[PDB]
């Protein structure tokens, strides 16, 4: 029953799991788990882009075995970089973020937990979660990578929040 | 050591292109 790359597929460094929630634990529901770039695109092709939703919603993309909640053992001592977005940016930013995460672009070893895009009333929020909030070398490198892969204006505000706060 | 499986953004999209075209049998 283990999810594994298919023949001739491009394997990922980790299995990942898509989740979603909609404001209407089991608030957050699994969509599916994938092991290769091809499986990722197949899953992705079925999902509405976050910019095409206007109701209170979230997508979560986390390493398999990590629940998208801070109480998870992998998240308990961690934190996240948060970027608030005016409407119209979330779809492209989400895609850029998860491609970077899946492709191991952050170069922080095992530290990445997952990514979230949140659709709110007059803004959207994108974030990337890591395991150790007190690891400044790691959080700084994640910040630098975000700057490079999101391609947002240079004065874009990013904020780091430790989960326990 | 580096991870085994590193993909640039362009490499991710190159794979998408391949996947898109596979409606024809090889």
Residue numbers in the entry:
A (entry chain A): 45 to 68, 79 to 219
B (entry chain B): 49 to 74
What did the study's authors say about this model?
In this study, we identified aminoacyl-tRNA synthetase-mediated cap-dependent vertebrate-specific translation initiation machinery and investigated its structure, function, and molecular mechanism. TRS exhibits dual functionality to determine the vertebrate specificity of the machinery via its unique N-terminal extension that represents a gain-of-function component, and its ability to select target mRNAs. In the present study, we discovered that TRS regulates vertebrate-specific translation initiation. Thus, its association with either complex was somewhat diminished compared with the other components. These results suggest that TRS acts as an eIF4G-like scaffold and represents an eIF4F analog that acts independently of eIF4F.
The canonical motif of UNE-T is located in a position similar to that in the complexes of 4E-BP1–4EHP15, GIGYF1/2–4EHP15, 4E-BP1-eIF4E16, and eIF4G-eIF4E17. The residue corresponding to Lϕ in the consensus sequence is substituted by Mϕ in TRS. Residues Gly30−Asn48 in TRS were also not observed in the electron density map; hence these flexible regions were not included in the final model. Based on these results, we propose a schematic model for the TRS-mediated translation initiation machinery. The TRS ABD determines the selectivity of mRNAs by mimicking tRNA anticodon binding. PABP then integrates into the complex via interaction with the TRS ABD to form the efficient translation initiation machinery. Eventually, TRS links the complex to the ribosome via interaction with eIF3 to promote translation initiation. Herein, we identified a translation initiation machinery resulting from an evolutionary gain-of-function that is unique to vertebrates.
